[PDB]
Amino acid sequence: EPHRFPPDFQWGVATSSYQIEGAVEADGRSPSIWDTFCARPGAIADGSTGAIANDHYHRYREDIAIMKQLGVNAYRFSIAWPRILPDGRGRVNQAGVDFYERLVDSLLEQGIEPYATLYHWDMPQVQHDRTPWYDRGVVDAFVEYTDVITRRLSDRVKYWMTLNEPWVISFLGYGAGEHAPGLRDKELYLRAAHHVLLAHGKAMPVIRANGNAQTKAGIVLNLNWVNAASDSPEDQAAARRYDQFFNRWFAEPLYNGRYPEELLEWYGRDLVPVQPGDFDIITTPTDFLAVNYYARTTVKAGSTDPMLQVDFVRPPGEYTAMDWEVYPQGLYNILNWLHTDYAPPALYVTANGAAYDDQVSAAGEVDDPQRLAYLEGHFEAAYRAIQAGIPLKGYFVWSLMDNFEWGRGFEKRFGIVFVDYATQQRIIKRSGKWFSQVTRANGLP
Numbered sequence: 001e002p003h004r005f006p007p008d009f010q011w012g013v014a015t016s017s018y019q020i021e022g023a024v025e026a027d028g029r030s031p032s033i034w035d036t037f038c039a040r041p042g043a044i045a046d047g048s049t050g051a052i053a054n055d056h057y058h059r060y061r062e063d064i065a066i067m068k069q070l071g072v073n074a075y076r077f078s079i080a081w082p083r084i085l086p087d088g089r090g091r092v093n094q095a096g097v098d099f100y101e102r103l104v105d106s107l108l109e110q111g112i113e114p115y116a117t118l119y120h121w122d123m124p125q126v127q128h129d130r131t132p133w134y135d136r137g138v139v140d141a142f143v144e145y146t147d148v149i150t151r152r153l154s155d156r157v158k159y160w161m162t163l164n165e166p167w168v169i170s171f172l173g174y175g176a177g178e179h180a181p182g183l184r185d186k187e188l189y190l191r192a193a194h195h196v197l198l199a200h201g202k203a204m205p206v207i208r209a210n211g212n213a214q215t216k217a218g219i220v221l222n223l224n225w226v227n228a229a230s231d232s233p234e235d236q237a238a239a240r241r242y243d244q245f246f247n248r249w250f251a252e253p254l255y256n257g258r259y260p261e262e263l264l265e266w267y268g269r270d271l272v273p274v275q276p277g278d279f280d281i282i283t284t285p286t287d288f289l290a291v292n293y294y295a296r297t298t299v300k301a302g303s304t305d306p307m308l309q310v311d312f313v314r315p316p317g318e319y320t321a322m323d324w325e326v327y328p329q330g331l332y333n334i335l336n337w338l339h340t341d342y343a344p345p346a347l348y349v350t351a352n353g354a355a356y357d358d359q360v361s362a363a364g365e366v367d368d369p370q371r372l373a374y375l376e377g378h379f380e381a382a383y384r385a386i387q388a389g390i391p392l393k394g395y396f397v398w399s400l401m402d403n404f405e406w407g408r409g410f411e412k413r414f415g416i417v418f419v420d421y422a423t424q425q426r427i428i429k430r431s432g433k434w435f436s437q438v439t440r441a442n443g444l445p
């Protein structure tokens, strides 16, 4: 008896616009906050930018043919607000819309279901200058964008994700200074976090009004499995605080209409700009919850991170090139926690994958057995979740192909397809050849 997934299970790959598209000045696109941030010395580890990336804006048809080789029946991508409303608001850039029309039409004629992310971190610079995420006026700016693009594409796109990873947008963007726009302030991070939630919740009815009864939408949360380094009460408390910060800060508002109270107290409750009616907007019912999962994080009491008073421990085990612990049990644990605590009617894993050092062999192949082992372990965790009655409906590997990995630049490769950046050649890795059999078998051998 092989381990077969449900018959209509969605097997996909995931990307985002700035990480793959390139053509950053093409067809009316304006600079995003990432075009700006890549100029800052020290922001990108290898000094690179996303100006060219995978040149997917031009090569999308070739990428779709790769997806047909991989056997996926779903593709998760993002739309670039700077291509749709290059002035942030106001005049629709027809040529920008036209790209995503051509992309979606090409996917649907290959039988690949489109899963469109509205915001994956590439706000137009001209809009950020008016409404950073810490300014409540960002919410209506994002809803106007949502309205424009959902009006055009909703005849063909059924599955919509509002914002990709609120924790990253707010904390790395405004609290740690690691992502665009590169600010580092507790209050700015907490305002941004709140406004991300409100933007989600006000976009939900717009998506639903522009669609039909088949339309499904939800948010994407990054979640990792958190573990205490010891059982000293101070390490237990530090793990709990980290789990509240990373995993519960957005989930508790979305389902229960509250922040994690003891962390809210620790920060200073008045720093969160909550207005009456906000939790009623944030809790607007969704069709699914999407999860991006990578690792187990082990926390002790310490002062490495001064904001939370925690340090990290690396348990003995296997690690990726990103020094992220490989812990597939954690995926099962996360899905099971969400199911039991929040009961979302459907779950998707919208990103899971690994970066390992890849090399093209003399024969032109890319042999990545560690990445293959990573994926096999996490697909097994997913299968166990389904057998336990968790309504997991789909799984998207991060990523289709090697791409710009934000503050790591091009030096970290997450694809199941290798990209030679000198030539734009795509080579399916060994992991991608294995995945090609998983999607077709609808399960593990």
Ligand SMILES: OC[C@H]1O[C@@H](O[C@H]2[C@H](O)[C@@H](O)[C@H](O)O[C@@H]2CO)[C@H](O)[C@@H](O)[C@@H]1O
Residues within 6 Å of the ligand: 165, 168, 178, 222, 223, 224, 292, 294, 297
């Ligand atoms: O987990 C702590 C670690 O997070 C890093 O950000 C990751 C994040 O872990 C993951 O869940 C999300 O999906 O992607 C982001 C961006 O790579 C972060 O870069 C580290 O500073 C931080 O210590």
Ligand SMILES: OC[C@H]1O[C@@H](O)[C@H](O)[C@@H](O)[C@@H]1O
Residues within 6 Å of the ligand: 016, 019, 164, 165, 222, 292, 351, 398, 405, 414
């Ligand atoms: O950090 C690895 C990947 O994590 C995902 O969840 C993000 O949404 C991607 O943009 C990123 O490349």
